[PDB]
Amino acid sequence: DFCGAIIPDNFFPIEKLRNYTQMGLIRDFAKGSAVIMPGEEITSMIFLVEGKIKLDIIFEDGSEKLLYYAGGNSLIGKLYPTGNNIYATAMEPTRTCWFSEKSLRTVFRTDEDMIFEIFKNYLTKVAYYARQVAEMNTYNPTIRILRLFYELCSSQGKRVGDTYEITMPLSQKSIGEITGVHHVTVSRVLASLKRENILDKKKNKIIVYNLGELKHLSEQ
Amino acid sequence: DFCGAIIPDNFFPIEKLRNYTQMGLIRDFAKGSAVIMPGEEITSMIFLVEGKIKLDIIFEDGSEKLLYYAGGNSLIGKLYPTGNNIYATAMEPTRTCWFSEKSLRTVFRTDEDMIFEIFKNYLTKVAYYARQVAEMNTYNPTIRILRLFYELCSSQGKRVGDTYEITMPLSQKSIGEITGVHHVTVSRVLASLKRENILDKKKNKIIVYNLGELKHLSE
Ligand SMILES: O=C(O)Cc1ccc(O)c(Cl)c1
Ligand SMILES: O=C(O)Cc1ccc(O)c(Cl)c1
């Protein structure tokens, strides 16, 4: 039931939707193919059976921004028109199941519990983006990066001896896109955290050596 | 079925939940009272029967930001813990109806259409805040104000002679809360639009005198 997310990746997965694929439409996408083409009117929820999708918004002038990444058991909630132009691409071989409104009605008639899993996925999304707007309007770029590391550590960090490890590949490019901070700032902040023996951001994991100092710095 | 919103006010209203408030819990709030107290854990959808609520987020340092305004038939979607500290206050005398998960099961067993109205309400919120993040990362403060005015005109400007009128009280304060732009920028932009005979943002209405020019300046 917990609908917090720290990064916009794998928002509240619903693995149980796999039990209802007969009620929807299976569609596959090779790496690089468009799951949602720019300008395409989507009126389906799109369940990712396995794979990976990058989901962006496109503005009227052609500029493009990351919204989120989605993996196995993720759900794209675009049942109705929203007024946003969306471009979603497969990052690897991807199988999806598309559920129209009518299809979903058959799902919920079979399994009431599915309604609430979907609410939990929408809610996780609203809480994520609503907080992010507010944080962007409150905290400077360096503080947003520190808050991100601190939060990630408290949500996903597992203590291995005298330290915490967060097992995820979080690229500097991805940090930039998620925080809306320019690359020199990202590199400099990450480089000082490593230098001062607080946190080392590696390719495959983040190691936090001093969580109280990271917290303390994030609060300045 | 349209799940757009230009301003964080009266997100996708659900009038038909009025039909089911006997399945929920009616709670009344006086003007100035906390509908959602700071620190309060909420596990109900909260339907606004009548009145008005200002709903804010509060950070660990006690700093606070507007998320939205809600009026009659609005829905607060806080059925599960989110990890955000939320503070919601009644701006007028307010009647609400609180729907637990259990109460919602009863609603949906009765009328399956309510499922989908709630989906529309959530989808409208996601689309609003996700777009706002991306725009904040795309467009400078002044262009975000212009875009706000042009999109409001396009969606609900009413033609009156050579003008378009947007009938709403939208304060300079609220313009800054919505756009994330500081007051001195908001005042200078509004004063320049008025100077240049493009747009006059008055107290209870906004008049657009040159739409094509506003369109152009926003781009
Ligand atoms: O389509 C939109 O405007 C925003 C959006 C994108 C992806 C999602 O999964 C949702 Cl719920 C909304
Ligand atoms: O509770 C939150 O973290 C965000 C929030 C606030 C109000 C709402 O109606 C929703 Cl759906 C979410």
Author numbering:
A (entry chain D): 9 to 228
B (entry chain C): 9 to 227
What does the paper say about this structure?
The CprK associated with the o-chlorophenolacetic acid (OCPA) reductive dehalogenase (CprAB) from D. dehalogenans and the closely related D. hafniense has been shown to bind OCPA with μM affinity leading to sequence-specific DNA-binding, and ultimately transcriptional activation of the associated cpr gene cluster.
In order to avoid formation of the inactive, oxidized CprK under aerobic conditions, the CprKC200S mutant was used to obtain structural insights into the reduced CprK structure. Previous studies indicated that this mutation does not significantly affect CprK function and only has minor impact on DNA-binding affinity. The 1.8 Å crystal structure of the CprK:OCPAC200S complex contains two CprK dimers in the asymmetric unit, each dimer binding two OCPA ligands to the N-terminal sensor domains. Similar to the previously determined oxidized CprK:OCPA complex, the phenol and acetic acid groups of OCPA interact with amino acids from both CprK monomers through extended hydrogen bonding networks. This positions the chloride atom within a hydrophobic pocket at the dimer interface. This arrangement places both HTH domains in a position compatible with binding to the palindromic (de)halobox DNA. The CprKC200S:OCPA dimer structure reveals that each individual CprK DNA-binding domain establishes a small contact area [approximately 270 Å2 with a surface complementarity of 0.691] with both N-terminal domains of the dimer. A large proportion of this contact area is centred around an extensive salt-bridge network established between the DNA-binding domain Arg-155 and Glu-159 with the central α-helix Arg-139 and Glu-143 residues in addition to Glu-68 (in the sensor domain). In contrast, a significant set of hydrophobic interactions is established within each single monomer between residues Ile-14–Ile-15–Pro-16 from the N-terminus and the DNA-binding domain that leads to near-complete burial of both Ile side-chains.
